[PDB]
Amino acid sequence: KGTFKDYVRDRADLNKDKPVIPAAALAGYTGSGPIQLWQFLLELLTDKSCQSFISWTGDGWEFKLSDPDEVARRWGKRKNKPKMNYEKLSRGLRYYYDKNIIHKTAGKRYVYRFVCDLQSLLGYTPEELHAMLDVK
Amino acid sequence: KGTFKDYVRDKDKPVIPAAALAGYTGSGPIQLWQFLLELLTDKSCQSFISWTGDGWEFKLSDPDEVARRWGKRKNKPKMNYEKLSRGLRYYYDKNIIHKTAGKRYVYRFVCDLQSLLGYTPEELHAMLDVKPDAD
């Protein structure tokens, strides 16, 4: 067990992958109150550790979902909404399609793309984050 | 005004964050004694709550402000010092926090925090620049 001081030290020495765009801060910034799906997606995209199931493609704000179900799950376990899955996640993406926040790339299986002006909202450029995340 | 990048630009966290202590102790939801520890280990709260200099003894210079803060951290706006006192009374039965006889709004942690937190009262007082009260 050890003490709290050892716990902090150890976590600070081990845990080393904090998302560049935390959905939480983003909701506070946009004053959206409750966490939003598009904000959550950004958090996962600006987190190297998640590059296993979700990452940028290198072309603008385009990103692919290597494992859609992993996003859906982490989406349901983050909003404390276990009743949330890939299906209840697919409904959220189409809303974003009609609201022009995220568009699906034609031909691709699970390759979406943010179509709103993120650069003016986040302050970062696509190529910038791409470099901060070692995007390939 | 200003992009998110600029928004992030706008003192460090307290030594004993309640959330962390909760994770560490596995209590799950934040507990009042853990929250009190955070305010006591945060230089920016010394106006309404602070250490007295004598071990784990602390006092509430602004009880209502503590109760109000505790309210926002757990989403309970109707929170006042009366309710908070119920919490303190409970902590007196669980031997976590005791009240100092004679004084008012002066309590003391009586559990072995030193063995839990890994800090000594003297160590924390220095990191927070605490001056011993007068009596």
Swiss-Prot record, chain A:
Residues 23-30 are annotated as: Helix HI-2. Highly expressed within lymphoid cells. Isoforms c-ETS-1A and Ets-1 p27 are both detected in all fetal tissues tested, but vary with tissue type in adult tissues. None is detected in brain or kidney. It is found in: Nucleus; Cytoplasm. Residues 4-12 are annotated as: Helix HI-1. The modification N6-acetyllysine is found at residue 5. Residues 126-132 are annotated as: Helix H5. Induction: Up-regulated by retinoic acid, VEGF, TNF-alpha/TNFA, lipopolysaccharide and in response to hypoxia (at protein level). Ubiquitinated; which induces proteasomal degradation. Residues 35-115 bind DNA. Residues 118-122 are annotated as: Helix H4. It comes from the Eukaryota. Binds DNA as a homodimer; homodimerization is required for transcription activation. Interacts with MAF and MAFB. Interacts with PAX5; the interaction alters DNA-binding properties. Interacts with DAXX. Interacts with UBE2I. Interacts with SP100; the interaction is direct and modulates ETS1 transcriptional activity. Transcription factor. Directly controls the expression of cytokine and chemokine genes in a wide variety of different cellular contexts. May control the differentiation, survival and proliferation of lymphoid cells. May also regulate angiogenesis through regulation of expression of genes controlling endothelial cell migration and invasion. Belongs to the ETS family. This is Protein C-ets-1. The chain holds residues 301 to 436 of 441 of the full protein.
